[PDB]
């Protein structure tokens, strides 16, 4: 580990600087270093980890989609042969993306999830596991596609089960988990009805619990509820 010689607190400090500078690859490397110190992460630190990798993989996914669209067009009737370059470069980006996913999944397996006992941490990490398997599924085309999809499903489902038992329906982690699992259903699992049912039930159960919340908690929850509504509007 290139970050092995840097203090944990310094890695966290620098991750926050990297975020301010929109240097998300650096941010992710600092946070990977912090995880590899072996101590559990605080709430703030978990969110630094997720922001960093979300931004890195988000850029890769966007690039992959551009290149995949170009590649698809190249394989239409009437398209002139341009050689192996589009496929090669799409493959390059794909391999980089898979590498980032494998890095995140590796951190979760060694050893964030096994040490996470509180619902807020455990659900957070299992949601991340589902998310990064979902990103692997987006680019999968081979013999392991079904197993990758099932890995995402299994992680999300464990997170859902804990969240329903241990968290209020307005909890932002619970809401975000449901949002993303709903998208998994729609986009990955070919289950649009399940996606819609989950988003609607999640929204409605949160609505009914808003009365319990402070002004600041209400703002946090209603933000994510609006994302559920946005997806429902897209899908209906």
């Amino acid at each position: 580990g290139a970050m092995g010689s840097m203090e944990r607190a310094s890695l966290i400090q620098k991750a926050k600087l990297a975020e301010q500078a929109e240097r998300y690859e650096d941010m992710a490397a600092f946070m990977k270093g912090a995880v590899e110190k072996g101590e559990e992460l605080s709430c703030e630190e978990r969110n630094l980890l997720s922001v960093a990798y979300k931004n890195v993989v988000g850029g890769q996914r966007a690039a992959w989609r551009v290149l995949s669209s170009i590649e698809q067009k190249s394989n239409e009737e009437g398209s002139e042969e341009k050689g192996p370059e589009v496929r090669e470069y799409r493959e390059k980006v794909e391999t980089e993306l898979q590498g980032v996913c494998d890095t995140v999944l590796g951190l979760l397996d060694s050893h964030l999830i096994k040490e996470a006992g509180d619902a807020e941490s455990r659900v957070f990490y299992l949601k991340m596991k589902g998310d990064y398997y979902r990103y692997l599924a987006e680019v999968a085309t081979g013999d392991d596609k079904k197993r990758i999809i099932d890995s995402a499903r299994s992680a999300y489902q464990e997170a859902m089960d804990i969240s329903k038992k241990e968290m209020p329906p307005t909890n932002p982690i619970r809401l975000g988990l449901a949002l993303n699992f709903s998208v998994f259903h729609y986009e990955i699992a070919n289950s649009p009805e399940e996606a819609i049912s989950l988003a609607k039930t999640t929204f409605d159960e949160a609505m009914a619990d808003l009365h319990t919340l402070s002004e600041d908690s209400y703002k946090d929850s209603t933000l994510i509820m609006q994302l559920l509504r946005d997806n429902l509007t897209l899908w209906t």
């Binding site: 975000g176 949002l179 993303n180 998208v183 986009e187 946005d230 997806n231 897209l234």
Partner: peptide
Amino acid sequence: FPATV
């Protein structure tokens, strides 16, 4: 693309 967090 749908919203995720």
